[PDB]
Design a protein around this ligand. Structure first.
Ligand SMILES: Cc1cc2nc3c(=O)[nH]c(=O)nc-3n(C[C@H](O)[C@H](O)[C@H](O)COP(=O)(O)OP(=O)(O)OC[C@H]3O[C@@H](n4cnc5c(N)ncnc54)[C@H](O)[C@@H]3O)c2cc1C
Ligand SMILES: NC(=O)c1ccc[n+]([C@@H]2O[C@H](COP(=O)([O-])OP(=O)(O)OC[C@H]3O[C@@H](n4cnc5c(N)ncnc54)[C@H](OP(=O)(O)O)[C@@H]3O)[C@@H](O)[C@H]2O)c1
Ligand SMILES: NC(=O)c1cccnc1
Length: 529
């Protein structure tokens, strides 16, 4: 007899909803463990200036409760971190969740016992306890990547990763350096340049960026959106990226050059990087010729905006427009400020971090008070591999993942009975809340089935999981995403395996996959009782 029906790890969007479903809707005994000192996940940790979601606010939220959709107000097109955090706090209040969320608690081990058919969880604080079902909502973008740059530990000032940004830290009037120019570093840059006495940007690889179009909302527009939520969410759930805009069905090279220009400009004007990539034409991320047009458009904007021609050159990407799409308020314009300098690490790599700052290969010591690592994440599988997570035959998850991380349907793992993952390997790449909902609800139904039928284990087969990997690989290979150097395929971490880590078929497709497996008697699962 287990201590609990279920244990959930993580208190972001994922664990919050999971706990609600299992405890409030199914009546099970449940506890969440979260390592942070507060709920919110990404939106607890990422306290840096500029931190925000690029999903527009109207759809960066749960959809499952109509009353909450009616009552909760937003006032800006995009939601800054504090605002997302406040929403998730409200959710925890609303559904009386906080009493079952144990904070400051890192789970260091999770071990299946094949004899008792129970999971045993161990905390960093030295406690253990058992559950029949384990749900890991550990975050695709949660384990910080802090590179081993020589002399890093010598720096005498405040050295922080963005995913560990300290609430107390005020960079106003300080000399700040930032390493990294992905989505995090670019939004930080915009914000920080307005506060810092000097900002130095240490850029290894320039990225493409479009306007966000952020600003206040018209409150009458928010009321209209609320009145139309049913339609809005139907379109989200059937779409590929789930960002709340209608995706193009037009091939880029099927129209005239003037019409391409017009379409790109319209999207540029409206804002949002996912809109640029998927709201313009249907084939920007699959057809090299279409990709080249989109990339050219953005390069032309850089050249218009950035006054200094060497700065413009250093900011102009040369690679495929196939990284996670960026958007920002006035990113390239920030380089026109007198208090911002751009160091290309291709020209002058970092030689050593020193007590006073960063020394680049030209011998220049960049003197800093604050050094910010916007260096991204050990994405998707990082928190799984770092756990002592063991399944049948006492095998660690790493033994299953030697050619990259794997799952069946994003949510389960062969050899790991009664373990469910929220946003595990080889799941959807979308606006994440509605993907999380699809997964949570599917997991809930399957756990309920086990409860009603008296099942003791639920597990995918090895064959099912291998087929899923092949599905994901084949879809990925139909796109340009494998051909961009970034975290999506593992390439960002030295030594990490380059592998597919997402199902790239989209939300509507993904939802059908889940529904078809369930409706087909849980095709691919051993159900034992
Ligand atoms: C700065 C930033 C901007 C983002 N912008 C967007 C956006 O525009 N659109 C979009 O859809 N998504 C965006 N995301 C992705 C975002 O992570 C997800 O939308 C969503 O917040 C994920 O929720 P989650 O619950 O799956 O994971 P997370 O919010 O990552 O939560 C996982 C939690 O698990 C905890 N945890 C992990 N391992 C352990 C353990 N071993 N023991 C205990 N606790 C543990 C972590 O501390 C964390 O709180 C962004 C991410 C970042 C970092
Ligand atoms: N606006 C939002 O919606 C938003 C905001 C933040 C995060 N996110 C999400 O989180 C994901 C990750 O974004 P991120 O910006 O945190 O990480 P990222 O995309 O992985 O970017 C990391 C940055 O650090 C650089 N870097 C890494 N290691 C380095 C090293 N050893 N030396 C120098 N530079 C190094 C990378 O350069 P290279 O390119 O040369 O490797 C890159 O510029 C996004 O793609 C998005 O999915 C979203
Ligand atoms: N928008 C993002 O940040 C995101 C991250 C991971 C997967 N899908 C979307």
């Amino acid at each position: 007899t287990p201590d609990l029906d279920a244990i959930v790890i993580g208190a972001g969007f994922g664990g919050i909803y999971m706990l609600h479903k299992l405890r409030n809707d199914l009546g099970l005994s449940v506890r969440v463990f979260e390592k942070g000192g507060g709920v919110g996940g990404t939106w607890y940790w990422n306290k840096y200036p500029g931190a925000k979601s690029d999903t527009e606010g109207f759809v960066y939220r749960y959809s499952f409760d109509k009353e909450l959709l009616r009552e909760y107000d937003w006032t800006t097109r995009y939601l800054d971190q504090p605002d997302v955090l406040a929403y998730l706090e409200h959710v925890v209040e609303r559904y009386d969740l906080a009493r079952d969320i144990q904070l400051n608690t890192e789970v260091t081990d999770a071990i299946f016992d094949e004899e008792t058919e129970l999971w045993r969880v161990t905390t960093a604080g030295g406690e253990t306890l058992t559950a029949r079902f384990l749900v890991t909502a550990l975050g695709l973008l949660s384990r910080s990547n802090i590179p081993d740059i020589p002399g890093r530990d010598s720096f005498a000032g405040r050295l922080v990763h963005t995913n560990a940004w300290p609430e107390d830290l005020d960079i106003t009037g300080k000399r700040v350096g930032v390493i990294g120019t992905g989505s995090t570093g670019t939004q930080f840059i915009v914000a920080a340049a307005k506060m810092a006495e000097q900002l130095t940007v240490f850029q290894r690889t320039p990225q493409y960026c479009v306007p966000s179009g952020n600003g206040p909302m018209d409150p009458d527009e928010v009321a209209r959106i609320k009145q139309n939520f049913d339609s809005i969410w139907d379109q989200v759930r059937s779409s590929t990226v789930a960002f709340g805009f209608e995706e193009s069905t037009v091939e880029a090279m099927s129209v005239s050059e003037s019409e391409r220009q017009r379409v790109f400009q319209q999207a540029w004007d409206k804002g949002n990087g996912f809109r640029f990539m998927f709201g313009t034409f249907c084939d920007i991320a699959t057809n090299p010729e279409a990709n080249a047009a989109a990339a050219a458009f953005i390069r032309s904007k850089i050249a218009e905006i950035v006054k200094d021609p060497e700065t413009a050159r250093k900011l102009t990407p040369t690679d495929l427009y196939a990284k996670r799409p960026l958007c920002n308020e006035g990113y390239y314009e920030t380089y026109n400020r007198d208090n911002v300098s751009l160091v290309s690490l291709k020209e002058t790599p970092i030689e050593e971090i020193v007590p006073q700052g960063v020394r680049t290969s030209d011998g220049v010591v960049h003197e800093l008070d604050v050094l910010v690592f916007a260096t991204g994440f050990d994405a998707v599988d990082g928190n799984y591999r770092a756990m002592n997570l063991r399944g049948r035959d006492g095998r660690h998850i790493n033994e299953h993942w030697t050619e990259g991380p794997t799952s069946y349907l994003g949510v389960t793992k062969a050899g790991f009975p009664n373990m469910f993952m929220i946003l595990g390997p080889n799941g959807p790449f979308t606006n994440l809340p509605p993907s999380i909902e699809a997964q949570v609800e599917w997991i809930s139904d399957l756990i309920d089935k086990a409860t009603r039928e008296g099942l003791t284990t639920v597990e995918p087969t090895a064959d099912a999981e291998r087929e899923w990997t092949e599905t994901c690989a084949e879809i990925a290979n139909m796109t340009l995403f494998p051909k961009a150097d970034s975290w999506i395929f593992g390439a960002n971490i030295p030594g990490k395996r380059h592998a597919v880590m997402f199902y790239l078929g989209g939300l509507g497709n993904y939802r059908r996959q889940l529904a078809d497996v369930a409706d087909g008697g849980y095709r691919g699962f051993q159900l034992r009782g």
